[PDB]
Amino acid sequence: QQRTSSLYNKTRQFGITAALIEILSAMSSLEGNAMKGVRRNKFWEG
Amino acid sequence: VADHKGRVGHVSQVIGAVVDVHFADGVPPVLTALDVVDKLGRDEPLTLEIVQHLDAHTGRCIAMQTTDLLKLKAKVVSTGGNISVPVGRETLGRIFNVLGDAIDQRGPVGEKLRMPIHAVAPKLADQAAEDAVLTTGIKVIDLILPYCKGGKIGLFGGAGVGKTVIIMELINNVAKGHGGFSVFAGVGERTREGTDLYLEMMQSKVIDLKGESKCVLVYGQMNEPPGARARVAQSALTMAEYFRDVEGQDVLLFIDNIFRFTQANSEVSALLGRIPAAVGYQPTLAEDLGQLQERITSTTKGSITSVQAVYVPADDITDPAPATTFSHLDATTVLDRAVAESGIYPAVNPLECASRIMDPDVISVDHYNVAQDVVQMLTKYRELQDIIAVLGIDELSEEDKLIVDRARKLVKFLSQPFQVAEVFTGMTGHYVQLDDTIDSFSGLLMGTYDQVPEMAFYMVGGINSVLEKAKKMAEEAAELEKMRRAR
Amino acid sequence: FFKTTEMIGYVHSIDGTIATLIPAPGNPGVAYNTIIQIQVSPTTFAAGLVFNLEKDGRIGIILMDNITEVQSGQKVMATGQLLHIPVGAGVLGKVVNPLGHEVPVGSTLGKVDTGAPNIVSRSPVNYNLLTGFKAVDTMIPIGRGQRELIVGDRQTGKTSIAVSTIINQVRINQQILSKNAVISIYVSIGQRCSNVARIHRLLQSYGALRYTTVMAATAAEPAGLQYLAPYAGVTMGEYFMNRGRHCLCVYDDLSKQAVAYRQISLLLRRPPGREAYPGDVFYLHSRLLERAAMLSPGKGGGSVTALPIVETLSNDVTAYIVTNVISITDGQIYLDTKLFTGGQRPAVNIGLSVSRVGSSAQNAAMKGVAGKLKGILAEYRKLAADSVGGQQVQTIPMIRGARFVALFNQKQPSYFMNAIVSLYACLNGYLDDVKVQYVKFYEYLLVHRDLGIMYGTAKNKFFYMYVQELNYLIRFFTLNSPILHGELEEMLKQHTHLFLQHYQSKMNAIKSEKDVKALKNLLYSCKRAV
Numbered sequence A: 001q002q003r004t005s006s007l008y009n010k011t012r013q014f015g016i017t018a019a020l021i022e023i024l025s026a027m028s029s030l031e032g033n034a035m036k037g038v039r040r041n042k043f044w045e046g
Numbered sequence B: 001v002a003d004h005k006g007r008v009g010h011v012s013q014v015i016g017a018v019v020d021v022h023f024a025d026g027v028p029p030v031l032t033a034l035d036v037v038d039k040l041g042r043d044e045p046l047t048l049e050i051v052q053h054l055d056a057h058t059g060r061c062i063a064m065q066t067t068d069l070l071k072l073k074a075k076v077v078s079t080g081g082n083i084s085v086p087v088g089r090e091t092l093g094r095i096f097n098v099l100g101d102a103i104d105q106r107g108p109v110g111e112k113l114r115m116p117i118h119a120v121a122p123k124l125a126d127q128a129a130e131d132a133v134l135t136t137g138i139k140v141i142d143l144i145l146p147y148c149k150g151g152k153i154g155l156f157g158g159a160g161v162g163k164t165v166i167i168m169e170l171i172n173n174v175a176k177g178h179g180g181f182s183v184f185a186g187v188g189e190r191t192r193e194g195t196d197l198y199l200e201m202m203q204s205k206v207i208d209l210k211g212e213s214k215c216v217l218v219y220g221q222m223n224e225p226p227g228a229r230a231r232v233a234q235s236a237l238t239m240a241e242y243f244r245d246v247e248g249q250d251v252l253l254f255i256d257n258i259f260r261f262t263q264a265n266s267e268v269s270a271l272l273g274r275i276p277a278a279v280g281y282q283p284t285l286a287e288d289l290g291q292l293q294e295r296i297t298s299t300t301k302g303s304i305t306s307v308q309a310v311y312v313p314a315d316d317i318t319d320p321a322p323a324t325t326f327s328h329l330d331a332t333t334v335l336d337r338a339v340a341e342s343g344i345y346p347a348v349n350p351l352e353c354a355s356r357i358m359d360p361d362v363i364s365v366d367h368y369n370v371a372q373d374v375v376q377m378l379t380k381y382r383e384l385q386d387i388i389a390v391l392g393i394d395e396l397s398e399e400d401k402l403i404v405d406r407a408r409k410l411v412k413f414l415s416q417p418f419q420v421a422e423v424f425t426g427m428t429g430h431y432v433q434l435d436d437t438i439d440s441f442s443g444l445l446m447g448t449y450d451q452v453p454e455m456a457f458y459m460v461g462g463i464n465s466v467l468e469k470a471k472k473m474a475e476e477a478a479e480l481e482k483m484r485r486a487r
Numbered sequence C: 001f002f003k004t005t006e007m008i009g010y011v012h013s014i015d016g017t018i019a020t021l022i023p024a025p026g027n028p029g030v031a032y033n034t035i036i037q038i039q040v041s042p043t044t045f046a047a048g049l050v051f052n053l054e055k056d057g058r059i060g061i062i063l064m065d066n067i068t069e070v071q072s073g074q075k076v077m078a079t080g081q082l083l084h085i086p087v088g089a090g091v092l093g094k095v096v097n098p099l100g101h102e103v104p105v106g107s108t109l110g111k112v113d114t115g116a117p118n119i120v121s122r123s124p125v126n127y128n129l130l131t132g133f134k135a136v137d138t139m140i141p142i143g144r145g146q147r148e149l150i151v152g153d154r155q156t157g158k159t160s161i162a163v164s165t166i167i168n169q170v171r172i173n174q175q176i177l178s179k180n181a182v183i184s185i186y187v188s189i190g191q192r193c194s195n196v197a198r199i200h201r202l203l204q205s206y207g208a209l210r211y212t213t214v215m216a217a218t219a220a221e222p223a224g225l226q227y228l229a230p231y232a233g234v235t236m237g238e239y240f241m242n243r244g245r246h247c248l249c250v251y252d253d254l255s256k257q258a259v260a261y262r263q264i265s266l267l268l269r270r271p272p273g274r275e276a277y278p279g280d281v282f283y284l285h286s287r288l289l290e291r292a293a294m295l296s297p298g299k300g301g302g303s304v305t306a307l308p309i310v311e312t313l314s315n316d317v318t319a320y321i322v323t324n325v326i327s328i329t330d331g332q333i334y335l336d337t338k339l340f341t342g343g344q345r346p347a348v349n350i351g352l353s354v355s356r357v358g359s360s361a362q363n364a365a366m367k368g369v370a371g372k373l374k375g376i377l378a379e380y381r382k383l384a385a386d387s388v389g390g391q392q393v394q395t396i397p398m399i400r401g402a403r404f405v406a407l408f409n410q411k412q413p414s415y416f417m418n419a420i421v422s423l424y425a426c427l428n429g430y431l432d433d434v435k436v437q438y439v440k441f442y443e444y445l446l447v448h449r450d451l452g453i454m455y456g457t458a459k460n461k462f463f464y465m466y467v468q469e470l471n472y473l474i475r476f477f478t479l480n481s482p483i484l485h486g487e488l489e490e491m492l493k494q495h496t497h498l499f500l501q502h503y504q505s506k507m508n509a510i511k512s513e514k515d516v517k518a519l520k521n522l523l524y525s526c527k528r529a530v
């Protein structure tokens, strides 16, 4: 029981971490593809 | 910008199955169908559906066919509205696709009206209360989780547990004699299964080519791109809604598999610039499924008896997609792989199924009492199995041995040979009447058949079949004894 | 219909139920978390909620209605005011939208986002709120102003308990003054329209719509509409709290609101957290549940009792949302699937259930009975835990624990007098000679019949179970009082004697093929009759 409980705790922590890392990796990939276009502002007026 | 019919646009981006179109006069409304008029040397026409507006001029769309040979700046012309699908009795006996084009090579179809595949679900005031038991001819379903006419049913299960076979049995038992019409929607499943279903329906005269048919088939399968698998269900549901409202008929709606709709949406979500949710489904998993489910309902005009097969990835019933579908059903049938591996078919787990009409007010008092007693006995047997594993059957009390014997007979008596699985089993199927099931289980619970051999309840029909099998077992055992006696 | 002030921008992008705007000429500003109207047509508007105010001037909007009519390039008007919904005694008995619109079925205004009462504005939870179930009212007391969590698995009775609690107040509100009447508010989140209709019919059957209002944000509605349902519900309930009255708010269920909020956040590009939920999910649920309080006597003495419902997958209470809700509410009512399938209904798992308020939320009589019932049940559980695979010993603690477990089985909520009298009878050993199978029949005869009057043996002057107005006398004077103790014991003794003499004697002599079935049917009917 002690060994299985330790494995259960370890597995849940790893699963949470892996899921969060996967989501953040997807978010970073989405952010990277985004490109900043030309700014249409009165640059001289400054 | 009211009438956008014929509005011209140009393809601005192509990444996988998602295409961006730029309109100089303004992007048409979302969910609008577009046709790629440019001649790109393609063997099939290309049609896009607007799903999002990036700005006042650009719109992100999803293609219904493969985007091969698609160039940038390709001319695109709006169709003036959403995707339309033919409706009416002229569609009976035919096979359609997501776009509503006949694919059975059986000549043109005479369509008098077409309806968009996207529609608003019925409101609260358009809800009808229909509490009537639906006899499927299956002992487990009729007893533990009876189905209700005009309600929603779900067949949750993994891969290879028997979801398709149960659907075929339900068709054979309910659709051949159904007063109204039927609509089968194949979503992201094997094409050979569709061919088998079509052949079976033609043999069973449900689809009478020379006469009058009473069912419609709409197929979007695995080979199709994700765009078609996310709208074939909408097309089939639109046909069912027309039959419900305009014809005022009672229609059956078989969907297999409803999980593929969610899977297709998740596949396309990544390219639409949406951050994945937990597990990796699209963030709009709940609302997308809810909008479709609310359309599958019985209103004051007609009734739809919907049977949906739900796929549970890797038998993980806690997965978000299976978990989100439970609240959208009136009767859930949960299949278990462990039951199937033990030779029990259908592999229904009665301790995980539920029915809304499992109330004394809707069903008879005897039916409710028998079902509750069966469930309680099965739960007690499951509890006692652990003690048996540790101590042993010999260590249990006589009060517990009787429960164990009765529970084993109940477990084997829930199995039934289907008329559609004769090749799998090699024996003729049975159709058990509702009253026969109740009487047989009531007798078994109180010990009227304590002396019957346990195996006499395995893969049989009513109680008469049990007695006949017991007699056959006794005869063969006597023959074996005689053979031993001579030796 | 929200009154608009001026145009703020134009619709730029649409992503399902999430839209973004761009500034109008002059870059006019819009107040954060305010209502905006999108001119989807010359005469129609689509409601929206401001959620983001980007630096460049773009505005993140959450569409609330008429989403199919929203297109890029449309004109957006701003109201400059928070969301206010109609509230008052004129909304009871109606199905209402989270935006305040009435939903057709077949007095003042209130902000949906308001701060909870401060520390000095609260009082200890002392007034009880009877759910009508012996198990809950005894082992998991609920007091007005408390936040009790109904956590369980699918198809375990989560909604049934809340609906019964709402219905249980109908018989009480009719008798006592409207000052102490409990006004219910059932919030349906992400459910089906059919379920809402069935619940409406069920409430109307018992005449609970007169004291109850239903707020439904069903499936096929935008996630934004489902995200505001609990807040609008509490706002409707907070109207009675700030006027010295008591309200009961039910959320069915917070599990779906979290999903809707996660969808809204992800579609608006906000940092996801554990299980993809944003970092504001705990704050959302806390500021929702913290608005349920028990005001001090200096502020009228009103209260709001919260009964959030949460669904666990495979009895996993380690989920992100489940843990957050458990850490906020004052106790929980855990429902076990095995108990539900085993026959125990309501399937309250007393072992995992807890009420942090304690006996303070119990009546004098109920507290007195529970003080000993809890110990008896604990001893019975301990003894049973050591006799799983062996013949049990029929000692007094077990002989009464079995009856107590048998009495907790019930379908409909029980009137206080009936439940307390039955618990007292079982506590003093009047059911020791009654078989566990006949406990329900014994209770039914005690409540709906009178053996003493039937056989012309009753000698009590006033204490009869058909006098339903003794409930308040029992509440004021505990059962262990000289005013009622003598006649209560006399009635219980006489009823037990007559039952054992007449009914159980015939039951033990049943030998036939039809009488056995008749007795079984009678016992099953009595199981769900009281």
Ligand SMILES: Nc1ncnc2c1ncn2[C@@H]1O[C@H](COP(=O)(O)OP(=O)(O)OP(=O)(O)O)[C@@H](O)[C@H]1O
Binding pocket: B327, B355, B356, B358, B359, C152, C153, C154, C155, C156, C157, C158, C159, C160, C161, C345, C346, C410, C411, C412
């Ligand atoms: N105390 C009870 N006694 C008998 N039957 C009950 C009791 N409570 C609930 N039931 C029945 O159990 C079934 C499930 O109840 P309910 O609808 O409350 O479940 P739930 O927790 O809301 O599940 P869901 O996820 O479907 O909403 C229904 O058939 C209901 O009538």
Ligand SMILES: Nc1ncnc2c1ncn2[C@@H]1O[C@H](COP(=O)(O)OP(=O)(O)O)[C@@H](O)[C@H]1O
Binding pocket: B157, B158, B159, B160, B161, B162, B163, B164, B165, B166, B345, B346, B418, B421, B424, B425
């Ligand atoms: N009633 C049944 N009797 C015997 N075998 C069955 C039955 N139902 C399913 N099976 C088994 O499962 C196979 C069919 O699986 P199927 O119904 O397609 O499941 P799913 O669609 O859930 O993967 C059969 O070839 C057989 O091995």
Ligand SMILES: [Mg+2]
Binding pocket: B163, B164, B189
């Ligand atoms: Mg299949």
Ligand SMILES: [Mg+2]
Binding pocket: C158, C159, C160, C252
């Ligand atoms: Mg519920």
